[PDB]
């Protein structure tokens, strides 16, 4: 499974100050390009090593699209301000997500296009890439404007066309990088607590992609709501971490097994608390 996404944000600032526009490109959830209007020389910059392969014309063309996008968001922010009853001056947020998902066969699974205003759903292009779903009354005004101007058609053309052909190119250009997985390295920590109990914590470190599953078992039976787990978190070096813990009786630790499931592994890990 593969994907490309552009995550765009326009943030309006107090008084006279002009809005900040930021665009971030992702290939298979990894950041590959970034434009930031707050930069000294605003331009799309490479964020993945395999992007350096692109000629100077790529960067100028992409940068020019962002300069147009910045202005589009300025006029859209003003229009929304009026739909929700007001004039200029306020601090507001407009966000956009767009892109495509591909199968393992590189065929289009779906196009994707959504907007948020103040971090809440505003308008989405339905999976048919033809019709729109507005979140509220103000958004319905945009829906009718976009239905009248046939906006969905140009979105569908990019999502099924340009988006797929560029993702195919990115996937080819970043083959040695994008196909790489980092196996998790697991270990169990032992934290004696009250009532003659002990927290057994199962750690999974250094893995890529982020998707993982940690399970705890009592002599073959998997543990439900009883198990505590942290949200998967970036290690900061491109890999991720996660832990899952259970509270067990002291002296009975050897009856518990942790299992780690990750695509990067030759097979699932199985591990036990190991004394000194």
């Amino acid at each position: 499974p593969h994907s490309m996404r552009y995550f765009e944000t326009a943030v309006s600032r107090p008084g006279l100050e002009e809005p900040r526009y930021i665009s971030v490109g992702y290939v298979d959830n990894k950041e590959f390009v970034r434009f930031d209007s707050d930069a000294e020389n605003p331009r799309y910059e490479p964020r993945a090593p395999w992007m350096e392969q692109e000629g100077p014309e790529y960067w100028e063309r992409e940068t020019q699209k962002a300069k147009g996008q910045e202005q589009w968001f300025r006029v859209s922010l003003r229009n929304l301000l009026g739909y929700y009853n007001q004039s200029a001056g306020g601090s507001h947020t407009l966000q956009q997500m767009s892109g495509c998902d591909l199968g393992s066969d590189w065929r289009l699974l779906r196009g994707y296009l959504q907007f948020a205003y103040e971090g809440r759903d505003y308008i989405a292009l339905n999976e048919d890439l033809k019709t729109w779903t507005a979140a509220d009354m103000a958004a319905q005004i945009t829906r009718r404007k976009w239905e009248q101007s046939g906006a969905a058609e140009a979105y569908k053309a990019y999502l099924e066309g340009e988006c797929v052909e560029w993702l195919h190119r990115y996937l080819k250009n970043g083959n040695a990088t994008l196909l790489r997985t980092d196996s998790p390295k697991a270990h169990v920590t032992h934290h004696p607590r009250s009532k003659g109990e002990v927290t057994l914590r199962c750690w999974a470190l250094g893995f890529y992609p982020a998707d993982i599953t940690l399970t705890w078992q009592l002599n073959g039976e998997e543990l439900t709501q009883d198990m505590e787990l942290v949200e998967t978190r970036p290690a900061g070096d491109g890999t991720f971490q996660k832990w899952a813990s259970v509270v067990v009786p002291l002296g009975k630790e050897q009856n518990y097994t942790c299992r780690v499931y990750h695509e990067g592994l030759p097979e699932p890990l199985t591990l036990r608390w190991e004394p000194p």
Binding site: Y6, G25, R61, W72, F115, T142, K145, A151
Partner: peptide, 9 residues
């Protein structure tokens, strides 16, 4: 490569 919006909101 990125997409350009045309019709404003």
């Amino acid at each position: 490569a990125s997409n350009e919006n045309i019709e404003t909101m």
